[PDB]
Design a protein around this ligand. Structure first.
Ligand SMILES: [Zn+2]
Length: 372
């Protein structure tokens, strides 16, 4: 019923489990959010996405602004109504894609100018335009617009980029606050930057807390630094964010990354891996991933995973799915994606249950021992 309410029901070390109550629904944390790129979680009906256990999905402001257009979607009744997903949606601000998929990007204090990577150039993105688009889409959790710091990054480079983003966070906060409908029904998350430097990260955290947000995302990771660095950064970074607010680690998703991130205080995750690697033929299992295309699965009657409770593992064999993927059949992508998202959600449920029971540390250890 409330606009936004985060409650921690249990803790173990830095790990915690709880819920986020929003007008469109309850989000159980730690949470994994499936990625919905062009108003669709690839190869899945929204009801299937919900069936796997997902309480919230992520939409991106970049793609949607290009096709079919933020304004068009608003006119159509909003993203929820448009795609058939009635639960909460967290929208990325588009800053990282603007820099990864756009042609001739132009950075400036006002924002970034760019050329759409597919048809001319739906051109401008600033802190206020981003928030505006996110309002048009009707997202429940709005991400403040930021400027990306590549890896590696020199201290001065990381400092100046972090500083710009902190200014953009203020502008995003204000833009969000000026729109009453948005401010009253949605949530706004701020994003910490600072690369791998804790002084920078600290400054970013402090700026962010000064402005004040509903949740804090740890940005700049999973950009090539490797798990060791990521974890090392998380170790000093997460404790800098407000304890009573959710901590969201953007773009992080290998199963082992998630478990280690939760051990360091992360409550929310998103990643294209499960969907992406699904179309590719890679299925996640409690014994590590398997590539279903491999000839040894040609007559394997066992399900993708022997303990998985998803509809795919209850009804189809590795042999069939192996066939479908090798034949390039659409059902192959559909079945692989559903199992993978299903697997991710079961991992989050296992994580949440072990924290509530005070046995997460052992779960993590056992998980790693078997998965690897
Ligand atoms: Zn399954």
């Amino acid at each position: 019923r409330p606009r936004f309410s985060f409650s921690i029901a249990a803790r173990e070390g830095k790990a915690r489990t709880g819920t986020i109550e929003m007008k469109r629904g309850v989000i159980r944390t730690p949470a994994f959010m499936p990625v919905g790129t062009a108003a669709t979680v690839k190869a899945l009906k929204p009801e299937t996405v919900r069936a796997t256990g997902a309480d919230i999905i992520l939409g991106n402001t970049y793609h949607l602004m290009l096709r079919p257009g933020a304004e068009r979607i608003a006119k159509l009744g909003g993203l929820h109504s448009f795609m058939g997903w009635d639960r909460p949606i967290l929208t990325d601000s588009g800053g990282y894609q603007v820099m990864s998929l756009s042609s001739l990007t132009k950075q400036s204090e006002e924002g970034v100018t760019f050329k759409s990577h597919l048809d001319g150039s739906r051109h401008m993105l600033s802190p206020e335009r981003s928030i505006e688009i996110q309002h048009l889409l009707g997202s429940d959790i709005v991400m403040a617009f930021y400027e990306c710091t590549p890896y590696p990054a020199t201290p001065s480079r990381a400092a100046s980029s972090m500083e710009r983003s902190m200014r953009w966070a203020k502008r995003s906060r204000d833009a969000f606050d000026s729109r009453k409908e948005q401010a009253e029904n949605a949530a706004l998350f701020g994003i910490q930057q600072g690369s791998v430097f804790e002084n920078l990260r600290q400054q970013s955290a402090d700026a962010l807390a000064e402005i004040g947000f509903d949740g804090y995302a740890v940005g700049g990771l999973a950009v090539g630094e490797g798990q060791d660095e990521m974890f090392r950064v998380l170790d000093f970074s997460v404790p800098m964010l407000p304890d009573d607010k959710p901590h969201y680690l953007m773009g992080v998703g290998k199963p082992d990354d998630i478990v280690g991130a939760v051990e360091r205080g992360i409550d929310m995750f998103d990643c294209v891996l499960p969907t992406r690697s699904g179309r590719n033929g890679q299925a996640f299992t409690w014994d590590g991933p398997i590539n279903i295309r491999n000839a040894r699965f040609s007559e394997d009657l066992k399900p993708l995973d022997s303990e998985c409770h998803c509809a795919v593992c209850q009804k189809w064999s590795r042999a069939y799915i192996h066939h479908l993927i090798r034949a390039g059949e659409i059902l192959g992508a559909m079945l692989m994606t559903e199992h993978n998202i299903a697997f991710y959600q079961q991992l989050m449920q296992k994580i949440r249950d072990s924290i509530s029971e005070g046995r997460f540390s052992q779960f993590a250890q056992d998980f790693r021992a078997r998965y690897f």
